Symmetry: D3
Subunit: 60 residues, 6 copies
């Protein structure tokens, strides 16, 4: 399995390291797939590159 | 956060329902973000639409 | 520009044809780019393949 | 609906703010979905990271 | 490396098997990366799910 | 066809230019599609933004 997660910029390296492990376990657990087959890709978004309802996430 | 997970076709609706919840908790837990803000998208791949090392996963 | 839109399954061919044109104009208008350079990809999600807050979009 | 748009780097914050709103309206209008449910993600590409016909968009 | 290719529906399993191998070699060759590290995902688009210049690829 | 390739940061502009051409030929060759219709997008990942088996690609 290959997961790509889009998150807003601002998290520390620790938090992202945890996200990668926790999500990787959840995927492995749920599908009963070997953990080593899981690939996770984090993609950070600038606060002004993410809109919700037509407006920047930053202003809301 | 928005997660998109690519998995091979073949799982039951239950398994995918669990994957969505387990992964959603892991993301919420790891980043300390409200669960309700997590979005997960499952995308199934046909066995002959996924290659590893230049060969179909179906053959490996 | 290349746009990929994820929508829930259930819409008619007409609605999707309109979505593709309307969005294509909006992109061309906003960035002052030639309409012919805009590429749009629609990706439908099964109701049980989309989760919000850890739950299927279908049951909520 | 969740839209991810890939555009070449070089636009101002204003232009991108407009792109996000215009496209968000177009999606909401076309599918008759509540504007607040629309999510847009902008992803900029470096001029040397986008190819057309096997050649950099920068040189063509 | 992880490649995701969007193609129009209509190709045979043979053609897609060739696409996966050929593209996998090209990536491995160009970056001097071990072939076994290359991952390719094929994603088919319905003819009415792909627009060019605001119009279905199907009718044009 | 539209291809998006995720690679780890660290390659030179030459290598990426070659990746774009080689991959563009492979796609055009395999599907018998006009080279000029092929679109390639390169997306670099920071070493600490890519996980394999729950661990950073950098540390393993």
């Amino acid at each position: 399995p290959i997961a790509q997660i889009h998150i807003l910029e601002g998290r520390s390296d620790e938090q992202k390291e945890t996200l990668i492990r926790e999500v990787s376990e959840a995927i492995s657990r749920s599908l009963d797939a070997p953990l080593t087959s899981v690939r996770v890709i984090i993609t950070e978004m600038a606060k002004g590159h993410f809109g919700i309802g037509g407006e920047l996430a930053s202003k809301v």
